[PDB]
Amino acid sequence: GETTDGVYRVMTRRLLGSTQVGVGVMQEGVFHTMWHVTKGAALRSGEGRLDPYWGDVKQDLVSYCGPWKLDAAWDGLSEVQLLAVPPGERAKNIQTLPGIFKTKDGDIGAVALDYPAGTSGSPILDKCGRVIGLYGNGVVIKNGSYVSAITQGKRE
Amino acid sequence: DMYIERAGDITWEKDAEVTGNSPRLDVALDESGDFSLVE
Numbered sequence A: 001g002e003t004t005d006g007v008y009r010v011m012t013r014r015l016l017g018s019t020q021v022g023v024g025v026m027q028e029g030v031f032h033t034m035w036h037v038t039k040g041a042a043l044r045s046g047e048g049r050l051d052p053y054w055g056d057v058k059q060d061l062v063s064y065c066g067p068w069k070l071d072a073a074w075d076g077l078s079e080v081q082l083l084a085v086p087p088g089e090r091a092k093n094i095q096t097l098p099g100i101f102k103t104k105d106g107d108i109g110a111v112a113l114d115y116p117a118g119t120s121g122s123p124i125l126d127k128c129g130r131v132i133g134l135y136g137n138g139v140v141i142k143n144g145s146y147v148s149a150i151t152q153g154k155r156e
Numbered sequence B: 001d002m003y004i005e006r007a008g009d010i011t012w013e014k015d016a017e018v019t020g021n022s023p024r025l026d027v028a029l030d031e032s033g034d035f036s037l038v039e
């Protein structure tokens, strides 16, 4: 069905009413979302079907129809924008300066904004509007609030 | 059975709401893709 580039909500009618379980990015004919949003299941777009192509539980990412296309990276300096698409609410850009998630394999950007679990898959942007990662995979800090990583895949 | 609805363009918004802090956290990523705090 509709394959126009842009941000999309990921919905399900299996629970009560229509529940938003996440968000995704359509670019170059490929839908990109977080693995915990779909669990690798095939999606629907009107009458058309979207089949998974690549996926990884550790990276927590999954592409549909084709290989992962998003390849931009946070420069470790500039402010970024979370295009947060919350359940039942209109898409909205929030500007923030990410922090650092320091790990045994390297440093990673981290956006400290708290939103419902259904906001998972919302893209994080650079000043050019390029997708530098997806929101929805992180940790719960001493304050109770959520701190998400800036999860980006690899473009083969 | 999951489905997708469009929610808008992916664009930078000048004069957007500027909020949130920039913390420096020590974390570990396990085999299941779940982050955890290290102290």
Ligand SMILES: N#C[C@H](Nc1ccc2c(c1)CNC2)c1cncc2ccccc12
Pocket (backbone or CB within 6 Å): A036, A060, A114, A115, A116, A117, A118, A119, A120, A135, A136, A137, A138, A146, B032, B033, B034
């Ligand atoms: N939904 C969801 C998130 N849980 C999660 C996040 C990452 C993974 C899994 C579950 C499975 N393994 C990878 C989640 C949990 N708590 C608060 C959140 C606030 C914003 C966005 C996602 C959140």
